[PDB]
Amino acid sequence: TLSLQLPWVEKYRPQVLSDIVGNKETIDRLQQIAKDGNMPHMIISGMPGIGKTTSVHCLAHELLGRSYADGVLELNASDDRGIDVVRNQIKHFAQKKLHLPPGKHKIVILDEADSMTAGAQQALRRTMELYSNSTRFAFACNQSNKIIEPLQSRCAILRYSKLSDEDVLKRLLQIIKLEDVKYTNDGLEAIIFTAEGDMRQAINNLQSTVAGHGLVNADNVFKIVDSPHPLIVKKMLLASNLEDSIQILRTDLWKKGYSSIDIVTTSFRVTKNLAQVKESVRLEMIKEIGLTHMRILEGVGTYLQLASMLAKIHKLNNKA
Amino acid sequence: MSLWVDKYRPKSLNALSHNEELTNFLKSLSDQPRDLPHLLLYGPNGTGKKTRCMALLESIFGPGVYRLKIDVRQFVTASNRKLELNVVSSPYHLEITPSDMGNNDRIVIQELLKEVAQMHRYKCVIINEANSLTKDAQAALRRTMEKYSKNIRLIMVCDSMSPIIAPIKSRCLLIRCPAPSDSEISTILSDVVTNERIQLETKDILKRIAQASNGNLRVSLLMLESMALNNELALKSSSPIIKPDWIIVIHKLTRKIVKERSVNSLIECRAVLYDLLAHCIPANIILKELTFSLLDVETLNTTNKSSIIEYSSVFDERLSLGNKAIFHLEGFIAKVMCCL
Amino acid sequence: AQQPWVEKYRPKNLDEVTAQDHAVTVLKKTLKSANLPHMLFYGPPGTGKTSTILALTKELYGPDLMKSRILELNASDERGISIVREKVKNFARLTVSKPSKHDLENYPCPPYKIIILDEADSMTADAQSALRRTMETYSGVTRFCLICNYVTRIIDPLASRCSKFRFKALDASNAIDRLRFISEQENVKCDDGVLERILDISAGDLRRGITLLQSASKGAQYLGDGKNITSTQVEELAGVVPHDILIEIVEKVKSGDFDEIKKYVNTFMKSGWSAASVVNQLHEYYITNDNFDTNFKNQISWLLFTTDSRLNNGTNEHIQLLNLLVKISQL
Amino acid sequence: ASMLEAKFEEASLFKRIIDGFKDCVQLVNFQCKEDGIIAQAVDDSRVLLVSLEIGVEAFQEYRCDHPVTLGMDLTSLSKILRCGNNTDTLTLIADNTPDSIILLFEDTKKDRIAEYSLKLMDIDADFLKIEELQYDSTLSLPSSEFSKIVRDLSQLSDSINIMITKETIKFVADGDIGSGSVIIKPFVDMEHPETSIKLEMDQPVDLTFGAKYLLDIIKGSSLSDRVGIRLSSEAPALFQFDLKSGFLQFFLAPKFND
Amino acid sequence: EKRSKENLPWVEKYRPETLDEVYGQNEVITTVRKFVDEGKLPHLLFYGPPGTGKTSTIVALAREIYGKNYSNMVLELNASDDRGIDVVRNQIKDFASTRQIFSKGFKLIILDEADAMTNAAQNALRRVIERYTKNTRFCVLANYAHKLTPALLSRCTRFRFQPLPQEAIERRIANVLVHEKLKLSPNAEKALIELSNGDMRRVLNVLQSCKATLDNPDEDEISDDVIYECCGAPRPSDLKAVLKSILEDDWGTAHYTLNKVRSAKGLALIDLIEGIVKILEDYELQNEETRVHLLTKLADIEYSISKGGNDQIQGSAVIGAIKASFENET
Amino acid sequence: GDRGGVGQLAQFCRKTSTPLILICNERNLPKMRPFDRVCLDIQFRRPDANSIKSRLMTIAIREKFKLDPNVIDRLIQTTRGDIRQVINLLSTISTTTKTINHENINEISKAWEKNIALKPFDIAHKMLDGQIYSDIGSRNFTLNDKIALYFDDFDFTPLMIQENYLSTRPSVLKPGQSHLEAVAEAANCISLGDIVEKKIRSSEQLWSLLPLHAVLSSVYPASKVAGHMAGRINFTAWLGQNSKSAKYYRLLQEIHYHTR
DNA sequence: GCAGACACTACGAGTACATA
DNA sequence: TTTATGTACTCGTAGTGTCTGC
Numbered sequence A: 001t002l003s004l005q006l007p008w009v010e011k012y013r014p015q016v017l018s019d020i021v022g023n024k025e026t027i028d029r030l031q032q033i034a035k036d037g038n039m040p041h042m043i044i045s046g047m048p049g050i051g052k053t054t055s056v057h058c059l060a061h062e063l064l065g066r067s068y069a070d071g072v073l074e075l076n077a078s079d080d081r082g083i084d085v086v087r088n089q090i091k092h093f094a095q096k097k098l099h100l101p102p103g104k105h106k107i108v109i110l111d112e113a114d115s116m117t118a119g120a121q122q123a124l125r126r127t128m129e130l131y132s133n134s135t136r137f138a139f140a141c142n143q144s145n146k147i148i149e150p151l152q153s154r155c156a157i158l159r160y161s162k163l164s165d166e167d168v169l170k171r172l173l174q175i176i177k178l179e180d181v182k183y184t185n186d187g188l189e190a191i192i193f194t195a196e197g198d199m200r201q202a203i204n205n206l207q208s209t210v211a212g213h214g215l216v217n218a219d220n221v222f223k224i225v226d227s228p229h230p231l232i233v234k235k236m237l238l239a240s241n242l243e244d245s246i247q248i249l250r251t252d253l254w255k256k257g258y259s260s261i262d263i264v265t266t267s268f269r270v271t272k273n274l275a276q277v278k279e280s281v282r283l284e285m286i287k288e289i290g291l292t293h294m295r296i297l298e299g300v301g302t303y304l305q306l307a308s309m310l311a312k313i314h315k316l317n318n319k320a
Numbered sequence B: 001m002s003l004w005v006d007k008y009r010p011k012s013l014n015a016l017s018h019n020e021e022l023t024n025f026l027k028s029l030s031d032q033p034r035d036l037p038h039l040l041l042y043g044p045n046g047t048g049k050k051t052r053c054m055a056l057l058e059s060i061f062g063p064g065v066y067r068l069k070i071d072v073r074q075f076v077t078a079s080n081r082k083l084e085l086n087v088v089s090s091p092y093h094l095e096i097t098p099s100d101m102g103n104n105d106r107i108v109i110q111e112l113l114k115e116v117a118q119m120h121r122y123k124c125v126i127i128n129e130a131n132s133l134t135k136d137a138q139a140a141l142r143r144t145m146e147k148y149s150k151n152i153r154l155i156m157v158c159d160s161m162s163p164i165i166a167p168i169k170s171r172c173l174l175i176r177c178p179a180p181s182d183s184e185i186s187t188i189l190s191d192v193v194t195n196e197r198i199q200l201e202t203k204d205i206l207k208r209i210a211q212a213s214n215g216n217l218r219v220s221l222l223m224l225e226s227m228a229l230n231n232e233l234a235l236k237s238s239s240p241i242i243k244p245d246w247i248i249v250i251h252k253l254t255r256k257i258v259k260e261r262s263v264n265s266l267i268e269c270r271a272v273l274y275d276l277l278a279h280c281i282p283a284n285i286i287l288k289e290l291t292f293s294l295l296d297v298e299t300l301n302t303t304n305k306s307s308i309i310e311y312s313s314v315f316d317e318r319l320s321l322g323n324k325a326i327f328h329l330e331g332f333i334a335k336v337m338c339c340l
Numbered sequence C: 001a002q003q004p005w006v007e008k009y010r011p012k013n014l015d016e017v018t019a020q021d022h023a024v025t026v027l028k029k030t031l032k033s034a035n036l037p038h039m040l041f042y043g044p045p046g047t048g049k050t051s052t053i054l055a056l057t058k059e060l061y062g063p064d065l066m067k068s069r070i071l072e073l074n075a076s077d078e079r080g081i082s083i084v085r086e087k088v089k090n091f092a093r094l095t096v097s098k099p100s101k102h103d104l105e106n107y108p109c110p111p112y113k114i115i116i117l118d119e120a121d122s123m124t125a126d127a128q129s130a131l132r133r134t135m136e137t138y139s140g141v142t143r144f145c146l147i148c149n150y151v152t153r154i155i156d157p158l159a160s161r162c163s164k165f166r167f168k169a170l171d172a173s174n175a176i177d178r179l180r181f182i183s184e185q186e187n188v189k190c191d192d193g194v195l196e197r198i199l200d201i202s203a204g205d206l207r208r209g210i211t212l213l214q215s216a217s218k219g220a221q222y223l224g225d226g227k228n229i230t231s232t233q234v235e236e237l238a239g240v241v242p243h244d245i246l247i248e249i250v251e252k253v254k255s256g257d258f259d260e261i262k263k264y265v266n267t268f269m270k271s272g273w274s275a276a277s278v279v280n281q282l283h284e285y286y287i288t289n290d291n292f293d294t295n296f297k298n299q300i301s302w303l304l305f306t307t308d309s310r311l312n313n314g315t316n317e318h319i320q321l322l323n324l325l326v327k328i329s330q331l
Numbered sequence D: 001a002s003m004l005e006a007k008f009e010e011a012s013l014f015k016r017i018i019d020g021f022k023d024c025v026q027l028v029n030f031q032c033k034e035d036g037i038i039a040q041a042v043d044d045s046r047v048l049l050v051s052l053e054i055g056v057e058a059f060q061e062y063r064c065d066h067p068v069t070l071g072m073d074l075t076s077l078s079k080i081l082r083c084g085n086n087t088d089t090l091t092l093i094a095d096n097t098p099d100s101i102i103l104l105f106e107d108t109k110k111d112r113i114a115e116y117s118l119k120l121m122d123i124d125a126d127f128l129k130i131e132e133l134q135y136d137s138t139l140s141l142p143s144s145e146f147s148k149i150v151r152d153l154s155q156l157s158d159s160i161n162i163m164i165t166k167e168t169i170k171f172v173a174d175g176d177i178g179s180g181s182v183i184i185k186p187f188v189d190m191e192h193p194e195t196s197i198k199l200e201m202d203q204p205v206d207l208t209f210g211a212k213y214l215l216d217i218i219k220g221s222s223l224s225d226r227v228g229i230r231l232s233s234e235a236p237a238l239f240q241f242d243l244k245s246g247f248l249q250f251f252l253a254p255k256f257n258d
Numbered sequence E: 001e002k003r004s005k006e007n008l009p010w011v012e013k014y015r016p017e018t019l020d021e022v023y024g025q026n027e028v029i030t031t032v033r034k035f036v037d038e039g040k041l042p043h044l045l046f047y048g049p050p051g052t053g054k055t056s057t058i059v060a061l062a063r064e065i066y067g068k069n070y071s072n073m074v075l076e077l078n079a080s081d082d083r084g085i086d087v088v089r090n091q092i093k094d095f096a097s098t099r100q101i102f103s104k105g106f107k108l109i110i111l112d113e114a115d116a117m118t119n120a121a122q123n124a125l126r127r128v129i130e131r132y133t134k135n136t137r138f139c140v141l142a143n144y145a146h147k148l149t150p151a152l153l154s155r156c157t158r159f160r161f162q163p164l165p166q167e168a169i170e171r172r173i174a175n176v177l178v179h180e181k182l183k184l185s186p187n188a189e190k191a192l193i194e195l196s197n198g199d200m201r202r203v204l205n206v207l208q209s210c211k212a213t214l215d216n217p218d219e220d221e222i223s224d225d226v227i228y229e230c231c232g233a234p235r236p237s238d239l240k241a242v243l244k245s246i247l248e249d250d251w252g253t254a255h256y257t258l259n260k261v262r263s264a265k266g267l268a269l270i271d272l273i274e275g276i277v278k279i280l281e282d283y284e285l286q287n288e289e290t291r292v293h294l295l296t297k298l299a300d301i302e303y304s305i306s307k308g309g310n311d312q313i314q315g316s317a318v319i320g321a322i323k324a325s326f327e328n329e330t
Numbered sequence F: 001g002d003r004g005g006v007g008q009l010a011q012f013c014r015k016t017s018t019p020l021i022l023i024c025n026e027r028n029l030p031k032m033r034p035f036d037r038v039c040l041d042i043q044f045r046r047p048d049a050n051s052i053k054s055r056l057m058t059i060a061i062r063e064k065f066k067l068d069p070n071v072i073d074r075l076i077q078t079t080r081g082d083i084r085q086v087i088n089l090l091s092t093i094s095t096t097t098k099t100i101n102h103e104n105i106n107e108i109s110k111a112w113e114k115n116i117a118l119k120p121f122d123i124a125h126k127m128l129d130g131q132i133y134s135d136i137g138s139r140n141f142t143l144n145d146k147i148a149l150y151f152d153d154f155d156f157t158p159l160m161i162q163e164n165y166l167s168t169r170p171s172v173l174k175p176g177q178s179h180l181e182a183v184a185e186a187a188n189c190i191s192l193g194d195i196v197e198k199k200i201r202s203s204e205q206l207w208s209l210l211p212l213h214a215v216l217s218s219v220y221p222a223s224k225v226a227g228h229m230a231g232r233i234n235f236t237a238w239l240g241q242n243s244k245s246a247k248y249y250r251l252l253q254e255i256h257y258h259t260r
Numbered sequence G: 001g002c003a004g005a006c007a008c009t010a011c012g013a014g015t016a017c018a019t020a
Numbered sequence H: 001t002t003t004a005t006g007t008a009c010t011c012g013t014a015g016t017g018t019c020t021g022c
């Protein structure tokens, strides 16, 4: 069995708060907390892959360089995050006597706290209210709606935002300077367009393209990763001249092996997030796509159901 | 019992003179009990399907089939939800009804037929109101009735057998029970009034009962009893026709919809509909009666009547595919007032 | 015997299965070999899926090994995800039963056991997804045989793995020999066209045809006149609407006058006729007639189809029939 | 005559072997040949392997004409073994192309013969032979002492680090609530040779193991009074429990270190 | 299994045991081979329609990476097996944590049909993927990508298994006939391609059933008649005749022709309707409204057919829908 | 819930020899029902801006960070009177920039909006507003925002829309469309969404249709009857009439068992 | 040695959520 | 009093096995 090279996702994982590129105000605030020391309870939320847990880990490393292995607790959904284990472990950690530097506090990191049970969060509320001058919590969830209201009340909400293409380009050029590779600007633009703000997706696509071909060119990138289905579905829905939408479907979704359920769900999401057309036409289109979704889920999954959904959408578009 | 509908009931096929061809067919079935297929009697409600079933059972098994014993049984469902349904058992046969909660009747019908299937030679099973079974329960009943045939036989009673699934209708011998004619209702009511003591002078009142019942023997007998006790056992040729309060309020709602078309009238109709649904009347019959009362108004034009019946069909389909039973009626009334 | 003619005349071997020549031939040629694949029997009710699978079971093993090498699961027992995950997997993992010496002499017992799953369309999606890899993995020792009336309820991976054997509907051309054999064996006298009418009334439902024939024979025995069955008797027993009432319905429809149609529909619903047969006869009278142009038939086909689709989902027959007759009247 | 005829003296024996790896393994198979009833199975998590061999010496009378494979569910087998007394004598009976075995519980003290049948199973796991023969450290310590050490160190943490030095055996179990360090040195007890501990150190060994699987290992300490651990880097640990005729050797995969 | 091969269905008697034998998928197979030869193997995600060769590809890949003992060197967790978050927290955790027991190489975890997992299980699994990715690789097979958490898609590299083209199915058919000593006709081969619909399992099933149909497996060939009789599929000539009668002739003759075609070989209405839809796609239609009417009415027709009902009324509805849609000046 | 300690606390309230004080968030839980009147009903409200203003002036004096007297109203109204998050907000802002004015107040507000899950009355009140369905309102309050608003209380929102989808004076009427026509259009989609809800809560349990149920039950029916209201939001009356209907059913099967 | 006293895994029943 | 399977969590429960000491 051959050995495996470390993936570029964590082979170039940042270790300093200056390495991560993104929301400049957020990173400056994190650096200020790093220099000062008095870290408040924070709830970091945002889209996947935009550098949430890496910032928390870098901040904890900078704050507890010498006592990271002793005064930092890391829990996630992979651990038994239930009321008994949360109670016992968090209360044992929050009362443990560890002589940190005067500005440094214990940090309890809870990755992906969105999937955490309500009673465990209720216990965490009381634990945070008791032990706050010795330990400081730190959540990192994709959506902050799952976390109960009192936990957000006693924390400091800090939301991330999707990275602009400039920051993804800067990081990609930094990694390309770190490891030698031949690239074309068209290939990098294609990778950035495919990533859609997801830095981890960009790194995975770049690594896959380099391993598959060795040259980061537009054709190689489009061979490794296909065009995203939301874009082709949006092109299908927005286009008039029903025959054109029918052939777009039959060419780019049916013969490319996309399941009918996936096409219908993607159409629902696209027409929900669509902004070019007015509200009433979006509502009708959602109604028709939902009727087709009901038909598909009942079991009648064929090309003709999708064609009929497109036909009803186009009859709506031409205003009968 | 004080009611005249129940204790004036035939007990054998000989006493049944309502339909000669149906009685002859039942006698043909009862001649050889050894080879008896599964029955499914369908037709309009209240014509006496259960009377035919019990008469056939007595003609096959013998007497004592009317010695019904009320036996109670216990059932286990999901979580702690416990349902208690009493089975109306009897010698030589058994009766079961979907009186339990609609969503969970599959387990009950399943373990009753499995238990009775273990122990002339066979034991008949009568399922009253079979059109109310959920489609999964009928699917379970299919293989249960197909596997065991030497031990169990099903006489399945239902009106408007459309909700019955196709395989059940395939393995069930279908028997049609037509509604009583006006002459038959008049003859039965004449027999009842002759056996009892009511000061009756004109046959016109009996025919008016027959017309007002719409081929419903049970409703006709209830009407006769009601206005017989009201009229001090002396029927008058100009006696007003008494109708159930549900009919009266449905007609009042119909007149309210016809005379005014306003949103305040719509919220009043919502209140009335909620009251009627709380009064335990199935939404299908409510929609049917409301539609047939709307179509009887002479003020409405033919195009409005066609639109009303089309929307009535659409919302009847929605009611058959719904679980709230009030949203569909409210939508139907809104569409009707928009049309009017 | 003491059984209805449906159970009494159920096929025993695969030779008695009338029509369905493709599936029966494939199974009979598979009997000599041991290459039985995962089967997916489907078709209209009464076509003979259960009879075929039981005959194949009797032919492969014999009445001794059926109880030991066959597992059947109907809707009579629960078929959720847990039972499929535990009982079906446990049965599949088990080694095949030990044949007796007599069975090895007489029957060609294959080195596998058949897991019949009647009404597989009633399973949930999760149960079928759990069944997929169990079907694909332990297939060397067991064979699955799904039976369902609707393929669409089955998810597409199971449709991919299971070999599909569509069971054709039996009509007056395919199943006339079976009804003739039943009539000759049970000594039932009938006219030349009685059996054709019986098979025409049913729609691929030979079981219903057998029940109708048995009921007609019982009526003839009760009469005791020794007279051959006529088409009118079977027509009346089957629930078939007489043609005079259909002609009256058409006359009312052609004349308009919505109130008259409503009154006649109320009387018709009093008569107790099933709406499905009425719609079927209206279709057979209107489409085959030559007194109507192309546009009338084009509209009335859609009207009848919509009424049939609405009647399939339960609903009140009175309102659906009235609406259908009103829309046809306005044509 | 049944082709497989294996007789057990002191039928509590086979129950002890079955209970040795009932908890860790759920599905086994028994390649019964003329040499003896061997077995080998891998857990669902593919971490711990259980090899087994029972020689002809442990059987009163053993006769196996052809190689037999008996894929089994260990839960049902252990339940069947629990359906008897240690006084009774157990017998495994299988015919040609077996569908199930026959287990007999006979005793001449009182005629109460009980015949149980357990359904077989098609595991279809061909596995492979052991291809590990060279080990750095070969140590043998009493089973009771090792089981006790594992038991009181599994409560502190989930990882038990076994370190081998020059005549020094160290168990480190650092965890959330504290730490642990059990240091045991070789000594030869002349009075009780069974309580002696031996060490044979070639190359230094530093391996960590999971707590739950090590508890599953020590659950077999009732089978034999002494266990011989044979550690080596880039090699699974070999915990061998000797029998009167064969052995019950386990293979445990050390956790990764990064 | 039992009694070796030759007692297995042709679906699994012909299973790819080598990455060279996997036909149809060229870019995917070549990229995977380059991945494993170069030494870098990212978290693979195989997505495609059933029968394309996803699990066959991953099993052949595991066999090539490890050897003949790949069965116990990998952890394949199916929907048939329990895959709750307890399984993710225990079995996947300690299989990724521990070292290999039989070799020195990495650990491969094959989450076959992973779309049928709880969202909590995927959430717990994403941290296992991200933590032990230094020396353990996850492969995810998913028929539907909408049932997967977007984070789980983010961790894994997207690979798409396209429907099988004509050449792959023709080559596999040729190999099947070579091994079975069976003869085929080119027209029958084309019919098999049309019945495939990008699913080789269907082709293998139809070939097995057609060989069973033949009275003599040797000295005989499978023509179109055998294929269409055993599959119960409409012939192109019958579909063309039915469509011509519907589009040109009047109601009585068209109805008689459709009824005769259905009753000649017991043709199902659903397959005839699908054939009509496929033929009507090639038609050039000047009016857009005709397309809308055809698609909507026909879709309602198969929905009602799937719900069941009367076949005569549905056939008349098909005829009426086609005629009324083509009536408005094509 | 049942056997979860609430009945035990009711017993404690019934019989205690020492003062008993309970602290919770809000009373509209069906779990919180057994404390209807057995316990005292003192309630706290959102503190006034003047007391918070004085407290935060003292805080600004103590922590030597600049705090304008006018940005504090916006800081309070963004946080919805939650004083603890207000103090945390000023702390984390003053960590790197201790001076706040009109320049940064909009950024601070958009970055530290409280985002409370809305009360079942509030979902209906916001959804029935005609401003959000206008051209300007659609841009500011997108369709995804309305879907999230439904999913805030997806259990009670479909009903709460329905009991008062006709008690609103319309403001989004199409030219030539009467109010009754809009009400009928809304009722048609309520009926359509009823089927989707039944299919979700059935044997199959197809729970991927919830976003469909959002549009079919709350978004579209409220998109035709939006505008200012005739009265205050009426609570779901379907629950009480459903209870009364269930009791009437139970009585009818009871008298049916007795009459045989 | 026997009977308890303990901690232990295991089973049963009930609440809660289910698309971003 | 509502939904109606499957999943996950949480609890108290009853057996089950092991160590102390009369």
Ligand SMILES: Nc1ncnc2c1ncn2[C@@H]1O[C@H](COP(=O)(O)OP(=O)(O)OP(O)(O)=S)[C@@H](O)[C@H]1O
Pocket (backbone or CB within 6 Å): A008, A009, A010, A012, A013, A014, A019, A020, A021, A022, A047, A048, A049, A050, A051, A052, A053, A054, A055, A141, A142, A171, A199, A200, A203, E151, E154
């Ligand atoms: N601002 C950034 N600068 C540099 N690398 C980044 C940045 N954001 C993300 N990355 C890269 O993304 C990977 C880390 O992503 P994560 O922070 O683990 O994703 P995440 O924010 O935790 O989102 P989820 O919810 O866990 S999927 C590493 O490969 C980083 O190099």
Ligand SMILES: Nc1ncnc2c1ncn2[C@@H]1O[C@H](COP(=O)(O)OP(=O)(O)OP(O)(O)=S)[C@@H](O)[C@H]1O
Pocket (backbone or CB within 6 Å): B167, B170, C005, C006, C007, C009, C010, C011, C016, C017, C018, C019, C020, C044, C045, C046, C047, C048, C049, C050, C051, C052, C149, C178, C206, C207, C210
């Ligand atoms: N091809 C056939 N040849 C002979 N008898 C048949 C045939 N098909 C059906 N039958 C008769 O129909 C009855 C058995 O029907 P089944 O085999 O149960 O049909 P089915 O496929 O099971 O339909 P279901 O399961 O109820 S939907 C017996 O009376 C058989 O004689």
Ligand SMILES: Nc1ncnc2c1ncn2[C@@H]1O[C@H](COP(=O)(O)OP(=O)(O)OP(O)(O)=S)[C@@H](O)[C@H]1O
Pocket (backbone or CB within 6 Å): C157, C160, E010, E011, E012, E014, E015, E016, E021, E022, E023, E024, E025, E049, E050, E051, E052, E053, E054, E055, E056, E057, E143, E168, E172, E200, E201, E204
């Ligand atoms: N590219 C291919 N080359 C050769 N045979 C193939 C190919 N793709 C599929 N097959 C055949 O199809 C059979 C089943 O396909 P599998 O690969 O096992 O399942 P799958 O294609 O992954 O579909 P699902 O989603 O798992 S049901 C295999 O045993 C092969 O005989």
Ligand SMILES: Nc1ncnc2c1ncn2[C@@H]1O[C@H](COP(=O)(O)OP(=O)(O)O)[C@@H](O)[C@H]1O
Pocket (backbone or CB within 6 Å): B004, B005, B006, B008, B009, B010, B015, B016, B017, B018, B044, B045, B046, B047, B048, B049, B050, B051, B052, B188, B217, B218, B221
């Ligand atoms: N031949 C008959 N002569 C007199 N009354 C009859 C006859 N057949 C039926 N009935 C009446 O029908 C009533 C019973 O109807 P029932 O069986 O409840 O109808 P359903 O079966 O539709 O509920 C009895 O009160 C009885 O008087």
Ligand SMILES: [Mg+2]
Pocket (backbone or CB within 6 Å): A052, A053, A111, A112, A140
């Ligand atoms: Mg993270």
Ligand SMILES: [Mg+2]
Pocket (backbone or CB within 6 Å): C049, C050, C118, C147
């Ligand atoms: Mg069947």
Ligand SMILES: [Mg+2]
Pocket (backbone or CB within 6 Å): E054, E055, E056, E112, E113, E141
């Ligand atoms: Mg697969």
